[model samples]
Target chain A: PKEMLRAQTNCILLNVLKQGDNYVYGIIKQVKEASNGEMELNEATLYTIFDRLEQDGIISSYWGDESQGGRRKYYRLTEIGHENMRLAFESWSRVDKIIENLEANKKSE
Target chain B: PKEMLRAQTNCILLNVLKQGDNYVYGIIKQVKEASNGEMELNEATLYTIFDRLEQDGIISSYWGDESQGGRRKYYRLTEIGHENMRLAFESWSRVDKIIENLEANKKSE
Candidate 1:
């Protein structure tokens, strides 16, 4: 139910978290950068993923030091986060493999 | 909210439905065909989309003629279904554009 939404959100968040540590703003920045500014992560989508991943115990966050100016919370991945990434990759790969087979079959047909 | 789940499900269903009409079996067949059978739409996923689309008035269903030996509900798109197709296209298009730009930028980097 609600977990489905959370699960998707977590998947997206873990995808970004696996890259490295960053503050909330940093995460947003990296997503925009990674997405070439085309993504422009909406707050709802971004924070929703953050919260979901945090709740799943896959990712954890804390307040940034004054060295970064603003007191932003930095998020990082846990072992579970890596595990989540593995599962997500495999799940997506399965669908991808199916897609590959289908395309080939269609071409042959 | 659960609506997000419904929304995603609706997008996937409409993408397949816009192809044309058929029975529940046909919809399943076309989706499998379209996705190269990669998307073996599980019953939960398939019927959940069906029920939601019906509730949203985007699609309607009825019992098929016994001509096929077995009776199955035939599903068809309504006016809302066309509109759903347009919206779904635009929404997915936006995300696709983002991914496209990201890929291009990453390549350049």
Candidate 2:
């Protein structure tokens, strides 16, 4: 379960980097869109994830450019984070395949 | 994270009852097989989930006949469990669809 959460966080962070640098709000919006509205993360949960990732050294955060408006927190993946993404994807795919097979078996029965 | 664990537990429990009455060890084996070895639940975790589900009235357990040599605990889903299964499946489908969409979007990029 904890592993699932970590893998999901990895997916979100990796996808965030797919375009360019991003702020918290932008990342949340992207996640919602990417997950087709199934994952509507709240601010508190998102912040907790951010802090956890940063603390683990998988990601780093900085203040947004103040000139744009009020300062906002921004995040980007570190080298370790990129590796984590690859592992996470591999693990998720295995789990997905297993579940898919189980469903197929159920359908046949 | 906790939600993911709960969902997985729900999924496993529902699947076990899909056949007939089963014991904890049997349920674990079935889950492992069904998930293609992806989910290998430990004894402690399984017992904890069993206790939780029983307490919630989603399932009921009874002692098996000792004619088989040793008395084993068996479990069967309650009426409420059937309804829970339906809801759990629905929730899992939504999550699965979202992840599938996200993956497709990523591959397109």
Candidate 3:
């Protein structure tokens, strides 16, 4: 399950970036919102995930306009990220279907 | 996140089997109970996790007593499963610490 979360984080970050170029703090806010406050994310993990995603060519980042109070770097997903999200969603959907079937069986019992 | 839960399933399933041999239904019960009913698991997902772990040599299983009405298979974790659990815990703990720091920063702000 941890592995799944690890993958989902990358995918989710990419999805947030898909919306528009975003600062670190904004990204964190969107991520927490996306996960409905269940994520409870931190700066270190967020940065780490960012590093890996950039390394994997899933996303890219650059400094935004200096007008912002904190001059933070902004990030956006690459095309690879979109494909990755699709693939992850496919795999998760398969698992979800299996779980649904099991629950149905239990109901019949 | 969902990904975390995915990796966690193997770790948790192995943990549950560590208690002793258990039937499919019993294992599901233990897992859902372990997660405090948050998992919302089903048979297909559980079996899929079982198949993966067994293939990974993390666990083993065999048919249980036919005297039981369902004649379900019972499973147990191998030594490798324990080690995998340890490694996964290590990784997850690191992530947890990061999230902690992020939350602390938020509180301070």
What order do candidates take by TM-score, descending?
A: 2, 1, 3
For model 2, how does the per-residue alpha-carbon lDDT over B1-109 read when each residue is reduced to its tens digit? 3654665565556566656788888878767887767688888988888888889888898998863887899899889887866765565466556556656765786
Runs off by more than 4 Å, candidate 2? A1-20, A32-41, A66-70, A79-89, A92-109, B1-14, B31-42, B65-68, B79-85, B96-109
First chain of candidate 1, TM-score: 0.72
Number of the top DockQ candidate: 2
Across B22-107, the per-residue lDDT of candidate 1 in tens digits comes to 67666566557756555555677778778876997989877767757767777788997787567645654554454455445446
DockQ of 2: 0.25
Model 2: how far residue B18 lies from native, Å: 4.1
TM-score winner among the candidates? 2
Instruction: Write the residue-wise lDDT of candidate 2 on A27-75 in tens digits.
Output: 7777788776767777787777778878988788789778987788888
Clashing pairs in 1: none
DockQ of 3: 0.07
TM-score for candidate 1: 0.60
Clashing residue pair totals per candidate (backbone < 3 A): 0, 0, 11
What local distance difference test score does each model get?
0.62, 0.70, 0.67
